[PDB]
């Protein structure tokens, strides 16, 4: 839509900014706030009138060689205060108090790089991490427990790059460098019981370690959508949007056209393609698209600084309406975009450590 570019800035490290996220848990009446991640830091900024991007404070890791790749917001389920999780090459998930930028606590399992964090859409304590070690991990950050590891030889066979929960957090689609997209249901009796037990675990009141589920079989798998690394995935209701580095976002579903997603069996060998949104000059990998809170729109930047925005408020996915946003000084690769919760601001972040603000 009618976005215009109102400001830009550049962070002093001059390294790629791999991630950006608005805080969609920001309180009514408070300014909109987004986090960026790159180098060994996470930084918060607040959006103000006349395009102003006000710098607040950063968390910088003790290790000069950490490189954060991803971040995700949630809130504390007892106090409501927002929390920010960040992770990257060291394989350590940090939970940061965004007010003071203190690291409240940290988790290690992957010890191996973490490429995407996502919080469950209904339970602010359930955090999913995906790793260079080929596994996804589900953590409960209220009881500090590893609920489950999704892996095995029928899991991913190379780095996992992205994943996403469906609308109700019943199932996850993951994707990665093995070219595949895998479905993992977490509303099975086994996983619902595992989540319930994680909430019952308090290591001060018992002698047992908490046992993690090892989930070694996905509920569906395909390598038939893309022919290279699959680096971003999002559910759109029961359909999937996914991309690789082949200048396309494919909209598809498991099974045949009339197959209900909850009747798909793990042996399902067909997929249905509902449409494909092509674009240009985005053939490097780790380039992530984002949607607004309502899933009316989708944004992706490319490797020369162009933004594509598709309006998905149309009757079928292939009728999406595309708008492009360019600025003569924005020429570096855009790695991720984020919309504000009210959809009035889109930020893009770049490989040259620049930040670009477009206002509706």
Distance between CA atoms of residues 34 and 46, nearest Å: 7
Cα torsion 78, 81, 87, 90: sign: negative
Distances, alpha carbon 322 to alpha carbons 252, 275, 289, 304, 308, in Å: 18, 13, 14, 18, 7
CA triple 335-20-346, angle to 5 deg: 90
Distance between CA atoms of residues 261 and 359, nearest Å: 37
Distance between CA atoms of residues 5 and 53, nearest Å: 12
Count the neighbouring beta carbons within 10 Å of the beta carbon of residue 62. 7
Distance between CA atoms of residues 206 and 223, nearest Å: 44
Picking from 114, 162, 140, the residue whose alpha carbon sits closest to that of residue 212 is 140
The tokens describing 112, both together, are 């191996």
**What was the elucidation method?**
X-ray
Distance between CA atoms of residues 334 and 182, nearest Å: 26
Count the neighbouring beta carbons within 10 Å of the beta carbon of residue 201. 18
CB 35 within 8 A of CB 94: no
- Backbone φ/ψ region at 262: left (φ over 0), alpha (ψ -120 to 50), beta: alpha
| Residues sharing a CB contact under 8 Å with residue 20, sequence separation 6 or more, in sequence order | 34, 35, 36, 37, 336, 337, 338, 347, 348, 349, 355
CA triple 100-338-186, angle to 5 deg: 85
Going by their DSSP bridges, the two strands 334-339 and 345-350 should be labelled as antiparallel
The data reach a resolution, in angstroms, of 1.6
Rg (CA), the chain: 20
DSSP assignment, residue 155? S
CA triple 5-306-251, angle to 5 deg: 115
| Residues sharing a CB contact under 8 Å with residue 265, sequence separation 6 or more, in sequence order | 219, 220
Q: Which residues, listed in sequence order, are joined to residue 126 by a DSSP beta bridge?
A: 140
User: Tokens 């900014």, residue?
Assistant: 17
The tokens describing 185, both together, are 């249901």
The tokens describing 239, both together, are 């359909």
Q: How many helices (H) and strands (E) does the chain have?
A: 1, 29
- DSSP H or E segment with residue 190: helix 189-200
Count the neighbouring beta carbons within 10 Å of the beta carbon of residue 175. 29
Distance between CA atoms of residues 47 and 54, nearest Å: 6
Distance between CA atoms of residues 250 and 183, nearest Å: 16
User: Tokens 């209220």, residue?
Assistant: 142
Query: Residue 130, class by beta-carbon neighbours within 10 Å (0-12 exposed, 13-18 middle, 19+ buried)?
Result: buried
CB 176 within 8 A of CB 222: no
Coil vs helix vs strand at 32: strand
Query: Residue 55, class by beta-carbon neighbours within 10 Å (0-12 exposed, 13-18 middle, 19+ buried)?
Result: exposed
User: Tokens 């759109």, residue?
Assistant: 236
| CATH class held by domain 1-360 | mainly beta
Coil vs helix vs strand at 54: strand
User: Tokens 């020429």, residue?
Assistant: 331
CB 185 within 8 A of CB 177: no
Distances, alpha carbon 185 to alpha carbons 32, 147, 216, in Å: 34, 14, 12
Distance between CA atoms of residues 308 and 293, nearest Å: 17
- Backbone φ/ψ region at 237: left (φ over 0), alpha (ψ -120 to 50), beta: left
Picking from 49, 96, 10, 45, the residue whose alpha carbon sits closest to that of residue 344 is 49
Q: Which residues, listed in sequence order, are joined to residue 236 by a DSSP beta bridge?
A: 239
Question: Dihedral through CA 310, CA 312, CA 316, CA 321, nearest 10?
Answer: -40
C-alpha distance across the termini of the chain, in Å: 7
| Every domain of the chain and the residues it spans | 1-360
Strand ranges inside 4-151, DSSP E: 4-10, 17-22, 32-38, 41-47, 53-60, 68-75, 82-88, 92-96, 103-108, 114-119, 126-131, 136-140, 145-150
Q: Which residues, listed in sequence order, are joined to residue 127 by a DSSP beta bridge?
A: 119, 139
Query: Residue 215, class by beta-carbon neighbours within 10 Å (0-12 exposed, 13-18 middle, 19+ buried)?
Result: buried
Distance between CA atoms of residues 55 and 46, nearest Å: 7
Strand order in the sheet with 297-301: 290-291, 297-301, 307-311, 321-325
Coil vs helix vs strand at 107: strand
Distance between CA atoms of residues 38 and 15, nearest Å: 7
SS3 helix, strand, coil % of the chain, rounded to 5?
5, 45, 50
């Amino acid at each position: 839509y009618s976005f215009k570019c109102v400001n830009s800035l550049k962070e002093d490290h001059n390294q790629p900014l791999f991630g950006v996220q608005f805080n969609w848990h920001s309180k009514e009446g408070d300014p909109l706030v987004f986090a960026t991640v790159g180098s060994n830091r996470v930084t918060l900024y607040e959006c103000h009138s006349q395009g102003e991007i006000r710098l607040l404070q950063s968390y910088v890791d003790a290790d000069a060689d950490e490189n954060f790749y991803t971040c995700a917001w949630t809130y504390d389920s007892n106090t409501s205060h927002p929390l920010l999780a960040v992770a990257g090459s060291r394989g350590i998930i940090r939970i940061i108090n965004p007010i003071t930028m203190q690291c409240i606590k940290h988790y290690v399992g992957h010890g191996n790089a973490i490429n995407e964090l996502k919080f469950h859409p209904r339970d602010p304590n359930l955090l999913l991490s995906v790793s260079k070690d080929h596994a996804l991990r589900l953590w409960n950050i209220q009881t500090d427990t590893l609920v489950a590891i999704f892996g095995g030889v029928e899991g991913h066979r190379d780095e996992v790059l992205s994943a996403d929960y469906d609308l109700l957090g019943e199932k996850i689609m993951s994707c990665g460098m093995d070219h595949s997209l895998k479905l993992w249901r977490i509303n099975s009796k086994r996983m619902m019981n595992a989540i319930k037990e994680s909430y019952d675990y308090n290591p001060n009141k018992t002698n047992r370690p908490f046992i993690s589920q090892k989930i070694h079989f996905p509920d569906f798998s395909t390598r038939d959508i893309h022919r290279n690394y699959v680096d971003c995935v999002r559910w759109l209701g029961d359909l999937i949007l996914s991309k690789s580095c082949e200048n396309a976002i494919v909209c598809w579903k498991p099974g045949k056209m009339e197959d209900d997603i909850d009747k798909i069996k793990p042996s399902e060998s067909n997929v249905t393609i509902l449409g494909r949104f092509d674009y240009s000059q985005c053939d490097i990998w780790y380039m992530r698209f984002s949607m607004d809170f309502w899933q009316k729109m989708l944004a992706l930047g490319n490797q020369v600084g162009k933004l594509y925005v598709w309006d998905l408020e149309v009757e079928d996915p292939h009728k999406a309406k595309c708008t492009t946003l360019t600025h003569h000084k924005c020429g570096a690769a855009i790695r991720q975009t984020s919309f504000s919760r009210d959809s009035s601001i889109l930020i893009a972040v770049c490989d040259d450590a620049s930040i670009w603000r477009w206002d509706r």
